[model samples]
Target chain A: LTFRENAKAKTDHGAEIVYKSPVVSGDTSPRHLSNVSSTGSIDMVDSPQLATLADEVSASLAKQGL
Target chain B: LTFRENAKAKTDHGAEIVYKSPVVSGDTSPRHLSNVSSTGSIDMVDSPQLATLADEVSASLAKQGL
Candidate 1:
């Protein structure tokens, strides 16, 4: 089994995301039945440093007349 | 006091998100703070129908050469 690491996908959007991925690991060709739970907010951030990151995006969007 | 319905912000990005916001309402100028707890998954979706919505976003981004 390989360990999964963070995935940085592309998009110019920003926010903090929270999630839990509990895999009901299955093996028959490993048809795993699992669920991923998640949540997000554009108004709040996970930490002070992250808040700064969020602000950076917000400021950039604001500059674009959004 | 006013109620908060869903606020739809803009961006061309899309996905299904799950979240919970519990407010620790404060008042002194009523500075309210609570934490916005959220989670997300690009792989698993909450509902089968939401899976369709998630697929729609995936298709769009894919077509955009991401």
Candidate 2:
């Protein structure tokens, strides 16, 4: 889904995004995630940041066996 | 910073989020990140999902030697 669509889904389905940032090609924070009280945010970034984040995301998926 | 705050920064600095979802404690996506056309989304999920994402985030940070 699109970013906005996904975000709405989270909020509608009992979730809150407490933090968010842009995941730039080379930002200091890079593509990161943090949550609190059902709140979290998505940063917009790309490789090497994107690649790194994708690796992590896929890795987590792998661990879940999903 | 707060999610809203960070989001603003991203847009201000020229960034776009293409996808996003909540980082629930055990969502399928599990705190994922994807970027395209300066647009990427962040999903919200917690450990084991959060832990995994955090690990990846930290690992990337380490790789960057940051």
Candidate 3:
């Protein structure tokens, strides 16, 4: 329900980094770089749909006749 | 509206694994592994916070005033 919860959940689900580069300026693709692993791993998991965390709140509000 | 949407969303977000070892044993952590890259890559995405697929249906059912 919070940012930490989301982050933890992502890590818990078996995600690993395939590639990464924070120094993106131009032509910054995985091919353009070499040894692209320094910090942070992937959070591999399913994504969301039409509704997000915010959407749920909105939906709840609508239900309450707000 | 299905599992596919969630998987696609996660991949679109960008995720990678810094380290992963299948033979995890005896307080196994990233620090205990070496050259750990094989089999699969990270999905890289945000995690679900609360109220997953089943939650919505439950909410709607309760809201029917039933």
Candidate 4:
């Protein structure tokens, strides 16, 4: 499965931020992962043999400054 | 911000299934959401209005027929 994050500042430098998990899905296996946004959004997926795939993707985003 | 879902079904008929989204942040007003998985995972957000909304504490599992 896949995992992704969507975050945004509330203002120019405000603290009222907004964020959500965009999507998480399996590419070649069967692992189910999901999350819903209070902003009225949803995401789901499944893994194959490796269950840590989603977590790996999540960690990578930090390097990008998310 | 908030949304929740944790699904499971594999073996009875045997599907080899697993799911995630075990935790999510966003409670009051700020709306930040995050997802991480793959065995080793992570989740982060920046929603002040509704932060600290972990799905672990307050989330609804799938319905009867889900």
Candidate 5:
């Protein structure tokens, strides 16, 4: 099995993040899940909220065995 | 105290936030409080654990001398 590594899909206005890594074994598809969690401040204009949302999203990924 | 600032009040949201700031020397009725005080995330949706609730409110104003 190979590790795809956790990653984040970010953007300027906003970001759709993936908080987990994919496990690949031979021809197996892969698994995505949250590996960590963090916290921070944010604003409404998509300035600082993206990062925080990314963390939460990631945590959610990890929380669930995706 | 010569400044009538550091005033605070309610928020339309159910939450409440009040930071230190109140100085009024010129105006008799302008005596606010808070000479100093210091210190101090994210997420969305309908169903999520509230344990991760961080500083989801307003921030306290900076410093002001008498």
Candidate 6:
């Protein structure tokens, strides 16, 4: 998640130098599409179902008096 | 995530040098717990039950001729 880059410099004498003063990106956190991974889904019912399927089923069980 | 190590070497003249021949790791993908974020939950109706509650509700709706 972190990005690092070595330091670079050039002297007036045309000399090139690099410093290991490594650049560190503070975030260091992997970016994700968030809901993308959670976006995977299941079958549909009635075109537009209300609430979750689990709750739907629970309501039915209640009606069934089970 | 992928791990990269810089190439290091020393010369026969007692000189030390490092190569920027950046190493590439094959799997740059992040590894997450099998189902950590998903492990969170909703309220419970019962434990040790089988088949999911949605089906139960759907069955009830069917039984009620909805």
Listed in order, each prediction's TM-score against the native is 0.13, 0.12, 0.13, 0.15, 0.14, 0.21
- Model 3's DockQ score: 0.07
CAPRI level of candidate 3: incorrect
Residue-by-residue lDDT tens digits, candidate 5, B1-66: 232333357688598564443333452442333343233212232333433325754444443222
RMSD of each: 30.9, 24.6, 27.6, 26.5, 29.9, 16.0
Tens-digit lDDT track of model 3 for A1-66: 222212222343445432222222233222212122323444322232222233233234211100
Tens digit per residue, CA lDDT, model 5, A1-66: 564766556668875655565544667443553332222322223223222245324323212111
lDDT per residue for candidate 6 within B4-52, as digits (tens), equals: 5443232332333334533343434442213213223331121122233
Q: Give the Cα lDDT of each candidate.
A: 0.27, 0.29, 0.28, 0.42, 0.39, 0.31
Docking quality band of candidate 1, CAPRI definitions: incorrect
DockQ of each: 0.03, 0.06, 0.07, 0.03, 0.01, 0.08
Please write out the lDDT profile of model 4 over residues A1-66, one tens digit for every residue: 676887544567545443564555756575554544444334322322332346324323211110
lDDT of 2 at B17: 36
- Model 2 misplaced regions, further than 4 Å: A1-32, A38-66, B1-45, B49-66
Best by lDDT: 4
lDDT of 5: 0.39
Residue B28, model 3: Cα distance from true site in angstroms:
33
- Model 6 pairs whose backbones collide: A57-B54, A57-B57, A60-B57
If the candidates were sorted by their lDDT against the true structure, best first, what order would they fall in? 4, 5, 6, 2, 3, 1
lDDT by residue for model 3 over B1-66, one digit each (tens)? 222212111333446543222332233222212232223445322323333233233233111110
> What is candidate 2's CA lDDT for residue B30?
25
Considering every candidate listed, which one attains the maximal DockQ? Answer: 6
Candidate 6 local accuracy as lDDT?
0.31
Ranking by DockQ: 6, 3, 2, 1, 4, 5
Candidate 4 second chain TM: 0.14
